């Protein structure tokens, strides 16, 4: 074998901490605290992090390092009856990059658009504005801010799209920015870990520089502490509600990004006796720690808007791309030395996305390299052909209705697909493979068996955790609608196929593999449930 290894343990730590901390650390976690009882939200968030998140995060890093192979190989190497898990997972990562790179593109567009004396998104008297323009955020739908109109009429031109059917013209300025993103990713992933673990030194460390200069800037504004009150004033009545417990559960799970083959990919290049347990606890903490810090970078200036700009806190305390692309830029437009805070903020967004996307596409090439050696031998050729497909169909996200395209895939293509995949990930290692086997495996690696706490989490609460999250996602389900636009019913049907296409690889491969080996039934399960290492 003789597999490639990280050219330094910090290269692995940086590229994992990088992959783990992203935009959901800035534009989802602080809201939740605010929405769900301030600082009291940390009680269910932490317990759900200890019993449901960190267990699954730790588990995938061990299976990566222990089995020394990519996603599809490891699961076939582990339990062949469920080798489809590697395929479904790789398909999800293959789907995500078709659209979730556009966030790094929008970030690069605001970066390019910030080389100016007065930022554009502050005034209401541009050619792209409407009479319903307001200087700042409000609460009536038909009247938007100058930054909301700037984002949805100049950068997006979404006003020129009647829906998902109406993609309209193609914004060539945006198609260039998306090309730059795929160039940033290539010459950082074509040579592999040699450069990947090194380029991530910039993408994973820069946001902490930006978070610092933006924390001292936000905490020294007139009205910063008022936001810290909103962000953290504890209202322990939330803990009783079940929805907030699920809010804490679903945020904990996705913010660590497991069951996507990335941890399985990055860890496979570790040394066999690396203390992966220590690495799991360290990197996972820094993920939530970066989120705890970001909430101050956000809500300090979020209170500065309520104070000096006279805005309802409810009208600016948002989540998702709205938080980073309209309201926070609108507040930067008012503070002295505005153009500087914009550039460090917008490339904080970019460097947050790149290190995370790195792991996703790396999860693909490692898994495919470990299965098809003539593309393991042609990595810089293969990965040059992957982003080519990405740039082709990725032109849909640069069309005038590109956001309607982005929002549809965001709410179907990878959400539910990754929950049932990890649910089968969790029971394949605990029940089929066995905690006794899995614990015995990492005792060989790190010298000690995982505590009874860790495997009682891998065996019982992990399926309940994922079931709890899926139930609350299905309970609050509605047909997809953005702003005043309701999607057609065929568009909802398209999203479920994208959801099923990956996860169908579990039973479809399980079927195709089952009736492809000889013997009786029970004589066949013992074939498809004996691991590769046990039979040498």
């Amino acid at each position: 074998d003789e597999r490639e290894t990280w050219s330094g343990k910090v290269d692995f730590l940086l590229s994992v901490i990088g992959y783990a901390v992203g935009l959901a650390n800035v534009w989802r976690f602080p809201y939740l605290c605010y929405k769900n009882g301030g600082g009291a939200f940390l009680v269910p968030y932490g317990i759900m992090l200890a019993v449901g998140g960190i267990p699954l995060f730790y588990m995938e890093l061990a299976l990566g390092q222990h089995n020394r192979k990519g996603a599809i190989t490891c699961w076939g190497r582990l339990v062949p009856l469920f080798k489809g898990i590697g395929y479904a997972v790789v398909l999800i990562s293959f789907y995500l990059n078709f659209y979730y790179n556009v966030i790094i593109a929008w970030s690069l567009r605001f970066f390019f658009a910030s080389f100016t004396n007065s930022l554009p998104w502050t005034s209401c008297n541009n050619i792209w504005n409407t009479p319903n323009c307001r200087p700042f955020e409000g609460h009536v739908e038909g009247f938007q801010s100058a930054a909301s109109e700037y984002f949805n009429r100049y950068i997006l031109e979404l006003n020129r799209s009647e829906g998902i059917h109406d993609l309209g013209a193609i914004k060539w300025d945006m198609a260039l920015c998306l090309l730059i993103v795929y160039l940033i990713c290539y010459f950082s992933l074509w040579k592999g870990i040699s450069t990947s673990g090194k380029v991530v030194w910039f993408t994973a460390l820069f946001p902490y520089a930006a978070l610092l200069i933006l924390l001292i800037r936000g905490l020294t504004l007139p009205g910063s502490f008022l936001g810290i009150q909103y962000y953290l004033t504890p209202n322990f009545s939330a803990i009783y509600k079940a929805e907030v417990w699920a809010d804490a559960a679903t945020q904990v799970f996705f913010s660590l990004g497991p069951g996507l083959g990335s941890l399985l990919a990055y860890a496979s290049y570790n040394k066999y006796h690396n203390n992966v347990y220590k690495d799991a606890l360290l990197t996972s903490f820094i993920n939530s720690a970066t989120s705890f810090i970001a909430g101050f970078v956000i809500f300090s200036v979020l209170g500065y808007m309520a104070h000096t700009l006279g805005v309802r806190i409810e009208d600016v305390a948002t989540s998702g791309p709205g938080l980073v692309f309209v309201v926070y830029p609108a507040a930067i437009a008012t503070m002295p030395a505005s153009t500087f805070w914009a550039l460090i903020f917008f490339m904080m967004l970019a460097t947050l996305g790149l290190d995370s996307q790195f792991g996703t596409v790396e999860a693909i090439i490692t898994a495919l390299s470990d299965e098809f050696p003539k593309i393991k031998r042609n990595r810089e050729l293969f990965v040059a052909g992957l982003f080519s497909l990405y740039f082709v169909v990725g032109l849909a996200s640069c069309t005038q209705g590109g956001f309607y395209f982005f929002h549809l895939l965001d709410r179907y293509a990878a959400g539910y697909s990754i929950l049932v995949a990890v649910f089968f990930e969790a029971i394949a290692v605990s029940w089929i493979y066995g905690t006794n086997r899995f614990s015995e495996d990492i005792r060989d690696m790190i010298g000690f068996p995982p505590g009874r706490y860790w495997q009682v989490c891998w065996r019982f609460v992990a399926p309940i955790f994922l079931l709890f999250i899926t139930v609350y996602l299905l309970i609050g389900y509605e047909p997809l609608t953005y702003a005043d636009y309701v999607y057609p019913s065929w568009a909802n049907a398209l999203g479920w196929c994208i959801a099923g296409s990956s996860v169908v690889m579990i039973p479809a491969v399980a079927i195709f593999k089952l009736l492809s080996t000889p013997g009786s039934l029970r004589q066949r399960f013992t074939i498809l449930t004996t691991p590769w290492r046990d039979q040498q």
Partner: antibody
């Protein structure tokens, strides 16, 4: 509580074979790695072989690899060591030592069973 | 083979006195992997100290361990006659597992 007795032993002609056994008691034998470590009449402790809790990871010393074979029976809770092609340098008291977590060493030791090898 | 030599080979000491014995690995070992075993005459060894300095269950607090890397030591605060034994250091850091040469402790008289 936990206990370990070693069975077998005796004297063998050079090149002969013998199988020692360690009956484990007082603990869940199936979730603890086991190891054989001998010491010669000149009182030199020397580790021989380690077997994982599930028997899927096995390490030997260079001096016994090929000749010796270690095994587990987690049904009857017996640890075994099959010795073949014996040399005189193998005469020693043989200890069956419980040692799962490497950072915490060998928890409990057996009484020891003695092996002689002479013409 | 990480050979570990111990010094002295055999030391006598009056009760109440203090003793120090060393364990010199030929190659560096991690702190969490060196252990110490007391073996009394005509008896099987016993886990005495694990991870350089952590006492096992039963061994009194007059025993202590220290050292790192290639040099380690075992120290008895005030020696008693119930400590007359042979003390073995062991490395669990890499295979093959190796035990020290041993330090025989005897009572002065």
């Amino acid at each position: 509580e936990v206990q370990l007795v070693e069975s077998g032993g005796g004297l063998v002609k050079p090149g002969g074979s013998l199988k020692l056994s360690c009956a484990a008691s007082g603990f869940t034998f199936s979730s603890y790695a086991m190891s054989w470590v001998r010491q010669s009449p000149e009182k030199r402790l020397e580790w021989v072989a380690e077997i994982s809790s599930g028997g899927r990871y096995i390490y030997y010393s260079d001096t016994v690899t090929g000749r010796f074979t270690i095994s587990r029976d987690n049904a009857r809770n017996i640890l075994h060591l099959e010795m073949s092609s014996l040399r005189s340098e193998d005469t020693a008291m043989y200890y069956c030592a419980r040692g799962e977590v490497r950072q915490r060493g060998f928890d409990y030791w057996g009484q020891g069973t003695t092996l002689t090898v002479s013409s | 083979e990480n050979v570990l030599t111990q010094s002295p080979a055999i030391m006598s000491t009056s009760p109440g006195e203090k003793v120090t014995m060393t364990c010199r690995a030929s190659s560096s070992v991690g702190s969490s992997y060196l252990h110490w075993y007391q073996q009394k005459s005509g008896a099987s060894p016993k886990l005495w100290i694990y991870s350089t300095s952590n006492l096992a269950s039963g061994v009194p607090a007059r025993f202590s361990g220290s050292g790192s890397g290639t040099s380690y030591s075992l120290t008895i605060s005030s020696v008693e006659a119930e400590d007359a034994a042979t003390y073995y250091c062991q490395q669990f850091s890499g295979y093959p597992l190796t035990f020290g040469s041993g330090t025989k402790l005897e009572m002065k008289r």
